[PDB]
mmCIF file with all atom_site columns, C-alpha atoms in Angstrom:
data_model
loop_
_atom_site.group_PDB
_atom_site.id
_atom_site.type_symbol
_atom_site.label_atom_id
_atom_site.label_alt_id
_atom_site.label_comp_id
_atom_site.label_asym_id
_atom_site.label_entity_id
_atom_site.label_seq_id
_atom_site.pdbx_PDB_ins_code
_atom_site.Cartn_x
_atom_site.Cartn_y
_atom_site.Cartn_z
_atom_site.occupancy
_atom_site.B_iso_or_equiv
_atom_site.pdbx_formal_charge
_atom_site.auth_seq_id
_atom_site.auth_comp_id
_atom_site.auth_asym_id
_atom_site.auth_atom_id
_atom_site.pdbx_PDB_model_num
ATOM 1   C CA . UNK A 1 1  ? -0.521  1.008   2.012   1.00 10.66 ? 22 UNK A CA 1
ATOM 2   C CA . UNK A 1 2  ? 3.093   1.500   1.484   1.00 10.65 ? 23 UNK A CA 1
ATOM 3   C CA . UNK A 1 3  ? 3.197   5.359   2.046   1.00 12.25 ? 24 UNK A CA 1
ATOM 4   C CA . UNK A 1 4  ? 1.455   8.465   2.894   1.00 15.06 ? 25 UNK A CA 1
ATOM 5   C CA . UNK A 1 5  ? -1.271  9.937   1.077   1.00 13.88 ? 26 UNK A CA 1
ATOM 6   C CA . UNK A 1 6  ? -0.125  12.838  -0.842  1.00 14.68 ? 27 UNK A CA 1
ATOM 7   C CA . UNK A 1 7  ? 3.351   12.419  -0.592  1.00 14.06 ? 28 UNK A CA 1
ATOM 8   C CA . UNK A 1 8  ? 5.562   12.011  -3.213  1.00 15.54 ? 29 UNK A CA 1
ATOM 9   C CA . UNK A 1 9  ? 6.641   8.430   -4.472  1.00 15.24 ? 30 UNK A CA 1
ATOM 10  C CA . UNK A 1 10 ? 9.669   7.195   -6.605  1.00 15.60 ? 31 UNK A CA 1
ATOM 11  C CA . UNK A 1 11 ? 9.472   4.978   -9.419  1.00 16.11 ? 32 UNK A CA 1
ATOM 12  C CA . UNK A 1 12 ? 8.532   1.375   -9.371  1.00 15.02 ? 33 UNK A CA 1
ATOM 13  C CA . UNK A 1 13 ? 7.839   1.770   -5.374  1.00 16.13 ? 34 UNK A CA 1
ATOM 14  C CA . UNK A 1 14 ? 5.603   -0.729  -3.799  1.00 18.21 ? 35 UNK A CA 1
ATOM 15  C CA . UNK A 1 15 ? 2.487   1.192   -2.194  1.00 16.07 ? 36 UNK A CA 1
ATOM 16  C CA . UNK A 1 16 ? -0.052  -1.073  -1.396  1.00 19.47 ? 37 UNK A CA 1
ATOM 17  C CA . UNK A 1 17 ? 1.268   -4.416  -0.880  1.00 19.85 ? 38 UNK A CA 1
ATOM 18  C CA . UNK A 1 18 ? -1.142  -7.224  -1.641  1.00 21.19 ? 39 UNK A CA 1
ATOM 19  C CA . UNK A 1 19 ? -2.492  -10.460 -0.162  1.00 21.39 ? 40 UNK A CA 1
ATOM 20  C CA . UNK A 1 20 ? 0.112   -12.624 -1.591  1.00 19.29 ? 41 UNK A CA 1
ATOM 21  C CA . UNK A 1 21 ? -1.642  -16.312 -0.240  1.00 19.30 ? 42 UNK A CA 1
ATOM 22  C CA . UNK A 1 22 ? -2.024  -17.802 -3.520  1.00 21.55 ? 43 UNK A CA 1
ATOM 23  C CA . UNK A 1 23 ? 0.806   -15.930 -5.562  1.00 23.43 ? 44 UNK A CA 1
ATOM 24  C CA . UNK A 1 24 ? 3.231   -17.218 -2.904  1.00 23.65 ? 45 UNK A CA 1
ATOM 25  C CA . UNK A 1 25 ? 1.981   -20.100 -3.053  1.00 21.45 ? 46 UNK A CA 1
ATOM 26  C CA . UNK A 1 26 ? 2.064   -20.017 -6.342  1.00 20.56 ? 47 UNK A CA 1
ATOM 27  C CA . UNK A 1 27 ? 5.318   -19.098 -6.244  1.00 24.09 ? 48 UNK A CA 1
ATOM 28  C CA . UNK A 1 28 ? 6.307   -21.885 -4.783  1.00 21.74 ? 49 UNK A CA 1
ATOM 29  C CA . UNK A 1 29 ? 4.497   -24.305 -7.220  1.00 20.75 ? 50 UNK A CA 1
ATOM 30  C CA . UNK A 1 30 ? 7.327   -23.114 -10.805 1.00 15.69 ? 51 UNK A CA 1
ATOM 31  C CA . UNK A 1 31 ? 9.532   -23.294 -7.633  1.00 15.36 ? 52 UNK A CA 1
ATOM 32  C CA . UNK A 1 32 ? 9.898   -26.940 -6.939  1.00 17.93 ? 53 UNK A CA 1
ATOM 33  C CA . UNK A 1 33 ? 9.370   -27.475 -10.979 1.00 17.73 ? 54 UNK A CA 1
ATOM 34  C CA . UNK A 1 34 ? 12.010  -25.388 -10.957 1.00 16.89 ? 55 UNK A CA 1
ATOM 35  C CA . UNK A 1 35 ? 13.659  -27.500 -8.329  1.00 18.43 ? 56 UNK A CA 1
ATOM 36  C CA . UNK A 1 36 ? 12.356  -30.703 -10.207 1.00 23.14 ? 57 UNK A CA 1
ATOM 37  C CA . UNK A 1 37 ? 13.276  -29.080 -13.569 1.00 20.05 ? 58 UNK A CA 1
ATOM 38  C CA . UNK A 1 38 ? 16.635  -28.629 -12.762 1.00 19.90 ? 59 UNK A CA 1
ATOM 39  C CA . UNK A 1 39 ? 16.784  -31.894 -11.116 1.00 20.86 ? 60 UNK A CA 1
ATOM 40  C CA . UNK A 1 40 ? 16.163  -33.935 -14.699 1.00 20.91 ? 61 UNK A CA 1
ATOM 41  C CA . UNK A 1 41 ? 19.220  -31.930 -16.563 1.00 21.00 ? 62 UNK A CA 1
ATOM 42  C CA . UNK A 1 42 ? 20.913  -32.752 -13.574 1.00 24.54 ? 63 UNK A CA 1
ATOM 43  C CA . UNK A 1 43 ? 21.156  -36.320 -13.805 1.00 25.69 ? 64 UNK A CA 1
ATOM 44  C CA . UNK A 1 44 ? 21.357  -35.807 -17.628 1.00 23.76 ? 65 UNK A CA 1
ATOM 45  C CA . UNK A 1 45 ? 24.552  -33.876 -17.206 1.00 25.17 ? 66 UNK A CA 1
ATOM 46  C CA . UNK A 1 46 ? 25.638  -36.143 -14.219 1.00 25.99 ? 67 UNK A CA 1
ATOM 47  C CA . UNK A 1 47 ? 25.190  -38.843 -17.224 1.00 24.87 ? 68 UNK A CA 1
ATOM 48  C CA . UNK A 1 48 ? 26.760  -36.892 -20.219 1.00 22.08 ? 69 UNK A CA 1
ATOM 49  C CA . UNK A 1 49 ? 29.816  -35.701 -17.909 1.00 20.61 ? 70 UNK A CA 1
ATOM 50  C CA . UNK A 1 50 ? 30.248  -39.615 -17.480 1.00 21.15 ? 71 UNK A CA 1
ATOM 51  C CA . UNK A 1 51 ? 29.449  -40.743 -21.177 1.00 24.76 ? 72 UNK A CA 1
ATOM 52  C CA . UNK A 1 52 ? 32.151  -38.007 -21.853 1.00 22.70 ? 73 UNK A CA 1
ATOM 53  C CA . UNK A 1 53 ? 34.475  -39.789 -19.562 1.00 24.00 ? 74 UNK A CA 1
ATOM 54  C CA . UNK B 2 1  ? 5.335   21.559  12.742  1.00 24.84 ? 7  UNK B CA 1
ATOM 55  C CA . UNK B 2 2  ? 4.481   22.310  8.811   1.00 25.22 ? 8  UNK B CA 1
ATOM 56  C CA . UNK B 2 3  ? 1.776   19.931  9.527   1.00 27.56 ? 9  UNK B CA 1
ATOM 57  C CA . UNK B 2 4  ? -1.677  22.616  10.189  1.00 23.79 ? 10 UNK B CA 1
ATOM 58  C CA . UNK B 2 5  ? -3.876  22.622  12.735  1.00 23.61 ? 11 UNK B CA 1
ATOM 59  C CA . UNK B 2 6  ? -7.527  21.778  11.647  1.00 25.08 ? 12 UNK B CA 1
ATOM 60  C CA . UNK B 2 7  ? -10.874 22.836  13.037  1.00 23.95 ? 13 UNK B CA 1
ATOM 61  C CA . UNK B 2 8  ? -14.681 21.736  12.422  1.00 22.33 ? 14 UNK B CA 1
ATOM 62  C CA . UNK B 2 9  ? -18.212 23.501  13.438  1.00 23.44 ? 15 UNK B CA 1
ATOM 63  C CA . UNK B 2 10 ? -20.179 20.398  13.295  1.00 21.78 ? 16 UNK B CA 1
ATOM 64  C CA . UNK B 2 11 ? -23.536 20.356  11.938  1.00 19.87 ? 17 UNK B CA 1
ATOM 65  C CA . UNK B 2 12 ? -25.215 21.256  15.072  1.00 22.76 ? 18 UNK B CA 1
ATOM 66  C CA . UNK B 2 13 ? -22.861 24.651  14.589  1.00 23.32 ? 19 UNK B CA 1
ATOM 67  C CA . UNK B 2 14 ? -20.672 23.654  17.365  1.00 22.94 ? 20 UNK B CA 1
ATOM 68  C CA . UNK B 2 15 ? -17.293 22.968  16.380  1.00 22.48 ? 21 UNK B CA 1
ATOM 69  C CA . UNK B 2 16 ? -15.771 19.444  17.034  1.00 20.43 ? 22 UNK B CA 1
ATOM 70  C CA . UNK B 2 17 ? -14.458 19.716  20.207  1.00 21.27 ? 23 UNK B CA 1
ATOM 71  C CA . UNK B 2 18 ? -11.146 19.024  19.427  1.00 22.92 ? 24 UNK B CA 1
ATOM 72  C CA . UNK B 2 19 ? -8.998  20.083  16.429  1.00 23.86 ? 25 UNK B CA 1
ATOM 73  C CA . UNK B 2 20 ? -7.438  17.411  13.884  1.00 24.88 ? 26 UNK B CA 1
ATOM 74  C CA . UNK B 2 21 ? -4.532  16.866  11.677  1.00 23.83 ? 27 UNK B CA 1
ATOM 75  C CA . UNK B 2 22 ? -3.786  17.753  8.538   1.00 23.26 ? 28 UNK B CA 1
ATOM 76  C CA . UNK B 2 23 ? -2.608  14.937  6.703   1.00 22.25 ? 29 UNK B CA 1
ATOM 77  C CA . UNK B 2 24 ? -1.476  15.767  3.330   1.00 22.62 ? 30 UNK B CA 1
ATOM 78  C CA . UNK B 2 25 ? -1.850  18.229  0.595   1.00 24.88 ? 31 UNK B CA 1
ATOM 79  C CA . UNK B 2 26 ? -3.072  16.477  -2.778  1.00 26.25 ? 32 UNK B CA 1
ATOM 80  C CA . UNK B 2 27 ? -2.350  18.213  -6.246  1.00 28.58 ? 33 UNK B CA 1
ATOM 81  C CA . UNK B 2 28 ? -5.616  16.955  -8.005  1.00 30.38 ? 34 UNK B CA 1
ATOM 82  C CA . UNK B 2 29 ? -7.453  19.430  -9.989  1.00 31.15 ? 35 UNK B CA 1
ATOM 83  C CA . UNK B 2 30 ? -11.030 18.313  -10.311 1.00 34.60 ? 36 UNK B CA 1
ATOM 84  C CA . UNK B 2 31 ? -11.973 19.703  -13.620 1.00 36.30 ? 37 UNK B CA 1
ATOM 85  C CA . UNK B 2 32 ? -15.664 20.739  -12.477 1.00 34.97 ? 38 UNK B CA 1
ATOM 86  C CA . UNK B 2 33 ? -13.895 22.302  -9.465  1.00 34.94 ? 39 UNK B CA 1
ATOM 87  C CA . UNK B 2 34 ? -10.721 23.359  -9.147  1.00 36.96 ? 40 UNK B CA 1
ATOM 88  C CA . UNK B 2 35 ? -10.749 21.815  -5.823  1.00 35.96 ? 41 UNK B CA 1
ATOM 89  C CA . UNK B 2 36 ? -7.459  21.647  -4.140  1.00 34.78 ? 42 UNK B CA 1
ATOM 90  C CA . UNK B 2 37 ? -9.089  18.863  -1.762  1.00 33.43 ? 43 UNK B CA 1
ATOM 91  C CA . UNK B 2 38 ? -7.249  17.736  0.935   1.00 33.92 ? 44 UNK B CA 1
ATOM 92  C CA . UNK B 2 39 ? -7.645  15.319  4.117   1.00 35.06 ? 45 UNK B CA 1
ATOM 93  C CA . UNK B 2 40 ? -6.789  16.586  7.695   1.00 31.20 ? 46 UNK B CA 1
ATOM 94  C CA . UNK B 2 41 ? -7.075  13.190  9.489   1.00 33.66 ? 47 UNK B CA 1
ATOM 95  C CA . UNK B 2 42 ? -9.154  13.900  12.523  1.00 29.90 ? 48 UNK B CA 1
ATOM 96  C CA . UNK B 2 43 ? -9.576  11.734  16.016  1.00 29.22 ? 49 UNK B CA 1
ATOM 97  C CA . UNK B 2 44 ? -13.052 10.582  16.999  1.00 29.09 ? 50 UNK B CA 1
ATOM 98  C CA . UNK B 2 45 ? -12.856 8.740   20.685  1.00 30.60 ? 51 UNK B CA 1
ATOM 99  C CA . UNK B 2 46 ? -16.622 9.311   20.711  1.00 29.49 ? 52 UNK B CA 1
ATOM 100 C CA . UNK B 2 47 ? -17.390 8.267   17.036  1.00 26.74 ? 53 UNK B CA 1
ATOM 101 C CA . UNK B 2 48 ? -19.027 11.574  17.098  1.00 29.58 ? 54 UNK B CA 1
ATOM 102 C CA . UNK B 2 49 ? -17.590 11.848  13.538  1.00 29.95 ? 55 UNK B CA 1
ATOM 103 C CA . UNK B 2 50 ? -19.500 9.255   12.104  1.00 30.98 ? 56 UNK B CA 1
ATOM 104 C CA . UNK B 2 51 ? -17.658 9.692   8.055   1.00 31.65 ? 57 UNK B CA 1
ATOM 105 C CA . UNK B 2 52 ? -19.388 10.377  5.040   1.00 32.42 ? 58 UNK B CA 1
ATOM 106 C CA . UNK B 2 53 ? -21.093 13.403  6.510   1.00 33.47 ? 59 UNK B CA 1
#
């Protein structure tokens, strides 16, 4: 639990943070995508900045 | 010290033998009550307190 019981909270406050063992994990897994995403368009732009040249 | 001293006669009529702290003051309204419940955190070295009681 973020906070004391009762009290008064604000908007959009994290109270009870969660086991995140698969989520960041999971986060990780779009993450390299991501990372291997990107890394496709980058060679394709590497290659269309030279076939512009 | 806004925080209030809390008190118990235990079941056996005695009062716990020391008092305990309480915590916070909820706004719930139950709508069969119109109980202003609240918790006063309380220490048990003994486990004298034994919850649920």
């Amino acid at each position: 639990r973020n906070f004391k019981e009762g009290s008064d909270i604000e908007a959009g406050v994290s109270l009870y943070q969660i086991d995140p063992a698969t989520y960041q994990a999971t986060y990780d897994s779009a993450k390299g995508d991501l990372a291997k995403a990107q890394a496709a368009a980058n060679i394709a732009q590497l290659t269309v900045n030279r076939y512009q040249k | 010290n806004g925080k209030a001293k809390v008190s118990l006669i235990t079941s056996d009529g005695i009062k716990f033998p020391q008092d305990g702290t309480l915590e916070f003051s909820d706004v719930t309204v139950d709508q069969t009550t119109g109980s202003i419940t609240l918790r006063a955190i309380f220490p048990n070295p003994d486990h004298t307190m034994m919850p649920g009681m």
